[PDB]
């Protein structure tokens, strides 16, 4: 109705099409709303729960949501930056997830009090009702919030879920937000998996590697903020031929890399490059990046976050990569003198 009616009249091009990807991207939708609260460091936990029925459930704990928050972006408040603001799911495509659904139920817990708001064909009913008396917290916490939909059967081709990749993406959630508490509700199975990585992207490094044959104990770690702007990586090396380089913008994956990648690369080929008195050329990255399991993750305001074109797949912020650089490069230098990978990394050249 404005919004919900213009998104169910052409799905595919708000949740990229109606078959597999769309379907599950309607669940990545609910995850980024979550990874947005976290990044601000308002939201410690956060449930996914697939049923048998095809429905998805996402509950998130929260002391700053409001039903009235809530109520608004459900019909398109904050969608698409307008108007700007703030809120649980405020320029999010929470209303995507929503509007392509053939029902839902928004619980709002706070205060003591419950309100919940029931949806059909992508809609709110009304505002809501209060549930009195107040029905138990998923995880107990000040406030929460609860989202479960299902998505519409008329609109999507297909409608399972893929439990799999689903987890895999709650896992990666728990890396990119250190110390948020992530969990997969597999009800069917009568399966839960919590992740807690207090280390991040570096613990995750850890994880993708610990069957390969590690050369030193522990990833190379950084973690800092520049203008706003918070950058974790991570990189650790294996005795093996395979490279990984997985980079992120706010948790959604930069698949051709782009600035914040460059500045990493960049610092480490110079670091190795002084430390053997040679130049960067003798650093090829692909001589550099042998064995090594790499993790690059940016992540601010979603405003900042500039691509160098519509696919999103190449982070371009200016000045992001020469301050990176200089931030990491004699950091580099320090830490690689004593580290029992750099002789091994100074005779590729």
């Given at each position: 109705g404005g919004i919900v009616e213009n998104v169910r009249k052409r799905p595919g091009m708000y949740c990229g099409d109606v078959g597999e990807y769309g379907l599950h991207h309607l669940v990545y939708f609910l995850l980024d709303v979550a990874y947005e609260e976290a990044r601000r460091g308002e939201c410690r936990d956060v449930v996914l729960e697939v049923g048998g029925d095809g429905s998805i459930a996402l509950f998130c704990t929260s002391r700053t949501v409001t039903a009235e928050n809530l109520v608004r972006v459900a019909t398109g408040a904050g969608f698409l930056g307008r108007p700007p603001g703030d809120g649980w799911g405020w320029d999010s495509m929470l209303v995507v997830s929503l509007a392509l659904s053939s029902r839902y139920q928004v619980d709002i817990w706070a205060d003591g009090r419950q309100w919940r708001v029931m949806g059909e064909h992508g809609h709110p009913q009304g505002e809501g009702a209060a549930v009195t008396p107040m029905e138990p917290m998923p995880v107990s916490a000040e406030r929460g919030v609860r989202v479960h939909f299902v998505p519409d059967a008329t609109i999507f081709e297909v409608l399972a879920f893929d439990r799999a990749r689903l987890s895999r993406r709650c896992n990666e959630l728990a890396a990119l937000a250190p110390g948020l508490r992530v969990s997969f509700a597999d009800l069917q199975r009568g399966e839960r998996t919590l992740w807690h990585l207090p280390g991040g992207v570096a613990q995750w490094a850890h994880v993708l590697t610990e069957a390969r044959p590690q050369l030193h104990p522990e990833p190379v770690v950084f973690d800092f903020t520049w203008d706003g702007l918070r950058v974790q990586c991570a990189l650790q090396w294996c005795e093996d031929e395979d490279s990984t380089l997985l980079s992120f913008a706010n948790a959604v994956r930069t698949v051709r890399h782009g600035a914040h990648v460059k500045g990493v690369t960049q610092a480490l080929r110079g670091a190795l490059a002084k430390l053997s008195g040679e130049t960067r050329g003798a650093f090829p990255w692909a001589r550099v990046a042998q064995g090594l399991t790499a993790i690059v993750a940016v992540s601010g305001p979603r405003r900042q976050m500039a691509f160098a074109g519509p696919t999103k797949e190449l982070l371009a912020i200016p000045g992001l990569e020469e301050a990176i650089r200089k931030q990491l490069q004699p950091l580099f230098i320090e830490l690689l003198?004593?580290?029992?990978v750099t002789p091994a990394l100074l005779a590729r050249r």
């Open positions: 003198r004593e580290h029992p």
